[PDB]
Amino acid sequence: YTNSFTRGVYYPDKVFRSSVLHSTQDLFLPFFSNVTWFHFDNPVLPFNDGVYFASTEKSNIIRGWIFGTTLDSKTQSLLIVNNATNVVIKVCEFQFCNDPFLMESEFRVYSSANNCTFEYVSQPFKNLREFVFKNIDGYFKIYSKHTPINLVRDLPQGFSALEPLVDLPIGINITRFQTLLAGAAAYYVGYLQPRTFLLKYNENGTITDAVDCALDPLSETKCTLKSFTVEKGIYQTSNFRVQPTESIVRFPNITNLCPFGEVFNATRFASVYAWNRKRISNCVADYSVLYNSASFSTFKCYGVSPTKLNDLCFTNVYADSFVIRGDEVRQIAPGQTGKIADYNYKLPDDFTGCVIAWNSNNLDSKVGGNYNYLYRLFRKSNLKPFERDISTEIYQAGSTPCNGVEGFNCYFPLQSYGFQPTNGVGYQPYRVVVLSFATVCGPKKSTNLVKNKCVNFNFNGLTGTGVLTESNKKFLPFQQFGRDIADTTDAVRDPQTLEILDITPCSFGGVSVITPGTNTSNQVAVLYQDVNCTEVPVAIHADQLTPTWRVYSTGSNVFQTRAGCLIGAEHVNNSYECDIPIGAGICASYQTSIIAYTMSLGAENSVAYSNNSIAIPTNFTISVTTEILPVSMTKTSVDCTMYICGDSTECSNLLLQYGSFCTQLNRALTGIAVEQDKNTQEVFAQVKQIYKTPPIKDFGGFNFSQILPDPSKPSKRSPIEDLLFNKVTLAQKFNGLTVLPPLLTDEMIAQYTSALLAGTITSGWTFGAGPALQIPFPMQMAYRFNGIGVTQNVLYENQKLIANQFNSAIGKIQDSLSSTPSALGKLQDVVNQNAQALNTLVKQLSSNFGAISSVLNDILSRLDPPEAEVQIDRLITGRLQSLQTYVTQQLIRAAEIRASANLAATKMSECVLGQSKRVDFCGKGYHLMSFPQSAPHGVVFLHVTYVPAQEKNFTTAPAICHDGKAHFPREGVFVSNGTHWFVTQRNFYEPQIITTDNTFVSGNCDVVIGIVNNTVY
Amino acid sequence: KFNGLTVLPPLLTDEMIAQYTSALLAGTITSGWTFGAGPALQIPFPMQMAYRFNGIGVTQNVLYENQKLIANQFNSAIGKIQDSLSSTPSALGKLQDVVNQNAQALNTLVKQLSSNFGAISSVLNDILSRLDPPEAEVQIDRLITGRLQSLQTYVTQQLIRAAEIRASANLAATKMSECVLGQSKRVD
Amino acid sequence: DSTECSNLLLQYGSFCTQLNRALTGIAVEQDKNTQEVFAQVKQIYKTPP
Amino acid sequence: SALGKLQDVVNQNAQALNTLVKQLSSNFGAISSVLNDILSRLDPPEAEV
């Protein structure tokens, strides 16, 4: 017994495909399944819907195969044998052998050749010979391939596909298969099972990889995502249900047979105008004998299939019978017009019964005419359904009013049928009876009722699944059923014992798979949603999962969360920042095993609060941060008529009847294209002049070489822009889909951003509110320092340090972008989502929508107009909904880029053209300046900010009393180092002596709380 | 319930949100506006109030000389919030109006399973028990086309309604950065 | 629990793999909304006793 | 062209209402657009389809 080692794939069809990850749903060999092994023995082996036959030998031993269904001297089977130079195929009838064999020449396996049909003599641990057979669809297909092997252990790794060789159009059955060689040579036999695969075609068109969909959960995630590598995260794979155990059927006792014979075998029948009706109730009727009782001339009945009539229960059977004249039968049907249909007997359109008719010439044929049967003639109005008219008085039809007489304008209402034995079948009589459709039930049984397992039921007429537990919802002494909110079927009353149960369907849920990533490892964990996994292990959750899934459905580690229960992960106590979310504050990660824990919000910190304590920084740092925002998306135009008709003159005219649904889509698609140019203009084109940086570079030690354009490259783009362009690359033709080019190129956006940079460097904030006025850069930095509350002499005394920090900060952005390939993620999602929407709109053109074919050429050139409009119209309905869905989703998605484009316009005006005083709008810390950069479909902002450091604690007081007066600071605070008092600014430590010019006086020192004593110079 | 309708739990529970709010309150009480830009620096509360008075153009001797009055006014002002929230139950009308709209859309989806668009019945176990296979496919195809339209209208309105909530969440995050982590000079 | 359904529904294309992707996107979005409002302080602070 | 923005709101809200009324004069794959000729030329059982 040896399992499969990834072997046994073939080419399902003769169609060439390259570089496509196609999916198939054909019979295949399940992966990792054991096969039988044989080696001087060769017994019988059943065929059983497929074979993976393979024999390995270094010498020519295997000769041929013989098949069959019964292996007798009567059965038809093949006699495939191999000659010295040719091959022989013969599927005929011959003589079988109890122990056939085949050592130079042996002839003891056959002695008959009678009734032979097909002959097809044609060309034909060291070597593997693997063959695959199958018999289906009135055909028998043979596939094979061979390859040398250098191994002495077993079948090697990898696989190679199989190709067709021949075909044999035959109709036969086969239930046995035995080989015949020349101690016996080894070989294997495996069977085939329906499955679903996913194969890969290389460039040349050869299958080199395939995966299953029911082996392990990771394979299911691969199938759902349609790829061969899955990244980190949690994915939703499939659903989950329970299967029932058995069925219960319960019918009333009722033991008596319906009076069918007295209705069908009545000697005397009434008239059509005075049809008699008979009521049937509380009986058991078998309709099988009803059809077989006699040969009826017409049984075509509506609403119920006659085969299923034996398994339905009704409330009443209103039978009625009458007699008409020959061809008048055609009026006995709903929606018909005629004398019988109008003035005699009307069938309502909601009729749900059956009609049975037959002739009997040898029952009512008298010579000279049978005048006992009469039928109504000209009347006033139309008879309502199921209404009988019994009046036979003379009716007046004319202007002259007559009273009780006849003659002119007054005639006897009825008329005598001319039933004569020599009359034609058109005027011959006819016998008909109509059945119109709990009391009447058919034959059945009654199995004892179960109480704790969810099973099928057929209580009275309702079919369904669910559990049956006792119900304590008191019923009134006459009710039968019960229904809860939203009209859901519920508690039912048992016909045998007066009892009320409950109905609740078997449990269902959803399955998700957590994967660390195939690049790292392979093991996975599985989560069942909103299910208390007390039923999963064995006896309940076995409907679609192979036994390999059992280890992932039960085991040693099972942990119950609020989102369900997790199988395959262990529970720890300590908590970290979490990576993969699950829900209810539980996350999972990889520790190399899978770890599930609780989230941690952050670290701990207790600020030392006191009545008279303060903290003031003594140093600072300069920081730079990034920010990415999208501005625009790709223009797309789709042609109306080309998509749904495809250059067919027989389709265009059938579309004009629908109206203006076709020209209302192009306008909507043009609106977005118009908007995604104003989006860019609002953001980048807001300076009216082009500025240039001076040739020399003396900016006080600051170095702007990494954001300014370079003259040693044709692109005229900054190195940061080069990296951004190379990181992200800037949906097929045919079928009337086009892409329009943007109005502004990239070499123009580069010019705009260079102009903005030159303006902010050489002028400041002046060029955005009038004419541009020049100013040296360190003076501008002094002005910007004064805007956050720090005096300007701080900058001038620490110029070199600030310049060095600025230069070092800008040199780490390149690394922080080129070392993290997941940084420009916001701009990749807009590109990815647009391609997915356009990829589905082209796959929807290969769908039938309920038609013979999905191509308009085959339908047209296989049929004529009057019955081709029905098939075409069913394709213009489904192909128009696919376009309506696409346009609506794009209108919503474009309202999200407009919101992001409008925000980017605010940032450029308030962060690049000025200094902002709001918080977190323009980065962390205190804002100093900002610089713009260009992206393929967006913008990038680099912010420069101010952050304190190196704090120290002092002692403070709100005021000072001296000579009976209270002294207050002008702009500062009062601090002490333990012996002396000073005055300093709030964002930087720089002590000074308290005097008059930095202090104002108001009031005496007997009101404020916390005043201290000191001296003022 | 049932019929393929599930509700998933949020990632953050209520306790964690309570901890976040408590941390923000502690930071704003014991440290001022400093912790929103760097390391937290302590400062006594009346001095923080004196700082905040300077931002609106009032000199700081006004606060110190009337501390016991501002304290009483602040304490009395908060105590009236409970008496106004407890009464007038229509105060939280912006939060009930979003719970109702979602639940009014799940009812119309389930209630539409009781329609029988141009067919014999509304339940699929009766057209499959009273009819032959070749005929019981025109009736089944009519029910499918109606249930797909009902499930398509539901998704479109959820997309439009979701875009409206994202606008409010983007506004609230601005008020937390600008009116809680610092002082604001914008009007209203 | 009806196979005639699953055999008849396949002919309409992919009109409920598109409906199961919009709702997941909506559900995922109502987690950045809560994170963008409350989670903006790194540490946890405690009021003095 | 000074008051361009406000004029486009009026025009868009009037083009849409015109298209809706004009769509009442299309067959959609039937014999006639008016209901009083469908009934007055066909009998009910197949006039309903």
Ligand SMILES: *[C@@H]1O[C@H](CO)[C@@H](O[C@@H]2O[C@H](CO)[C@@H](O)[C@H](O)[C@H]2NC(C)=O)[C@H](O)[C@H]1NC(C)=O
């Ligand atoms: C203020 O911080 C700066 C850091 O930005 C300090 O400058 C560094 O000083 C160390 C000496 O201890 C040098 O090794 C570094 O090279 C300096 N940094 C740079 C960028 O040159 C500065 O000394 C600090 N000042 C005080 C008073 O502590």
Ligand SMILES: *[C@@H]1O[C@H](CO)[C@@H](O[C@@H]2O[C@H](CO)[C@@H](O)[C@H](O)[C@H]2NC(C)=O)[C@H](O)[C@H]1NC(C)=O
């Ligand atoms: C607190 O600061 C005062 C500043 O006035 C320090 O007092 C001076 O300390 C220097 C250092 O020896 C002396 O030369 C001066 O004579 C002191 N007085 C003045 C008026 O400058 C004081 O030492 C500091 N206290 C501590 C603990 O460092």
Ligand SMILES: *[C@@H]1O[C@H](CO)[C@@H](O)[C@H](O)[C@H]1NC(C)=O
């Ligand atoms: C009428 O009589 C015949 C006699 O052979 C019988 O076979 C048939 O079943 C009877 N009809 C009914 C409806 O039972």
Ligand SMILES: *[C@@H]1O[C@H](CO)[C@@H](O)[C@H](O)[C@H]1NC(C)=O
């Ligand atoms: C048959 O009659 C008995 C008598 O009480 C009772 O069980 C019930 O009415 C009938 N059984 C059924 C309907 O299964």
Ligand SMILES: *[C@@H]1O[C@H](CO)[C@@H](O)[C@H](O)[C@H]1NC(C)=O
């Ligand atoms: C400062 O606060 C502390 C804390 O209780 C206490 O000594 C007193 O309330 C205040 N002291 C002075 C001198 O104001």
Ligand SMILES: *[C@@H]1O[C@H](CO)[C@@H](O)[C@H](O)[C@H]1NC(C)=O
């Ligand atoms: C600015 O930095 C770049 C990158 O290190 C360097 O090549 C250039 O020489 C610097 N500028 C000056 C004026 O040295």
Ligand SMILES: *[C@@H]1O[C@H](CO)[C@@H](O)[C@H](O)[C@H]1NC(C)=O
């Ligand atoms: C300041 O000096 C006055 C005058 O003696 C005294 O009354 C007051 O208590 C002193 N204040 C402090 C804080 O020592």
